[PDB]
Amino acid sequence: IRSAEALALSDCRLHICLYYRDILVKELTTTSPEGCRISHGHTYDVSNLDQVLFPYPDDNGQRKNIEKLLSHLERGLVLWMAPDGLYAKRLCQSRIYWDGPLALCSDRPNKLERDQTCKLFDTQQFLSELQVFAHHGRPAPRFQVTLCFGEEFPDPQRQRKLITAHVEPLLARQLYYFAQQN
Ligand SMILES: [Cl-]
Ligand SMILES: [Cl-]
Ligand SMILES: [Cl-]
Numbered sequence: 001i002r003s004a005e006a007l008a009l010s011d012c013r014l015h016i017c018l019y020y021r022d023i024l025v026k027e028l029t030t031t032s033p034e035g036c037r038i039s040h041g042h043t044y045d046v047s048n049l050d051q052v053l054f055p056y057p058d059d060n061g062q063r064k065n066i067e068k069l070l071s072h073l074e075r076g077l078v079l080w081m082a083p084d085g086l087y088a089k090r091l092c093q094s095r096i097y098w099d100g101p102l103a104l105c106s107d108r109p110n111k112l113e114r115d116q117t118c119k120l121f122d123t124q125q126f127l128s129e130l131q132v133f134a135h136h137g138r139p140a141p142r143f144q145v146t147l148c149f150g151e152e153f154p155d156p157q158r159q160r161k162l163i164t165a166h167v168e169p170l171l172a173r174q175l176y177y178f179a180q181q182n
Pocket of ligand 1: 048051
């Protein structure tokens with residue numbers, strides 16, 4: 001019905017944040033409709049997906065372990081927004097834990113199967129959550145995906161998980177922002 005809502009619903013862009021031990025080390029908005037791949041090291045092939053590369057870690061302290069983890073993130077993780085919603089495909093050797101709107105607490109821990117497409121966010125469910133928000137004012141609809149690479153919990157020797165990501169479809173962010181203006 002509203003043409004601004006149609007635009008948001010049409011948008012395939014993802015907002016992505018990468019953390020090394022709970023420190024922001026990278027933040028971007030994807031531009032490609034085909035999706036994006038998060039990985040370690042340049043790949044010299046043809047691909048219509050955005051290449052999000054893990055940045056070089058800081059020299060101090062946990063560098064050796066992060067590097068080992070990065071070596072299991074070479075092939076990386078493919079993410080893309082369909083009209084349907086947000087999809088994920090793990091291609092890497094490193095295990096990938098996720099939390100998000102399609103996840104349960106009973107289902108936890110939530111792991112991405114290698115080479116298997118998993119759906120992390122669904123637009124119809126989101127629109128339903130968005131309706132509940134519009135009527136009652138709570139709760140905020142859920143649309144953030146959380147990813148940890150390699151670790152289900154922070155190591156005994158370390159306070160934080162080594163590498164974490166945050167993914168938001170801009171579609172949800174903008175629709176929620178709209179709903180807040182009223
Ligand atoms: Cl590309
Ligand atoms: Cl790579
Ligand atoms: Cl890998």
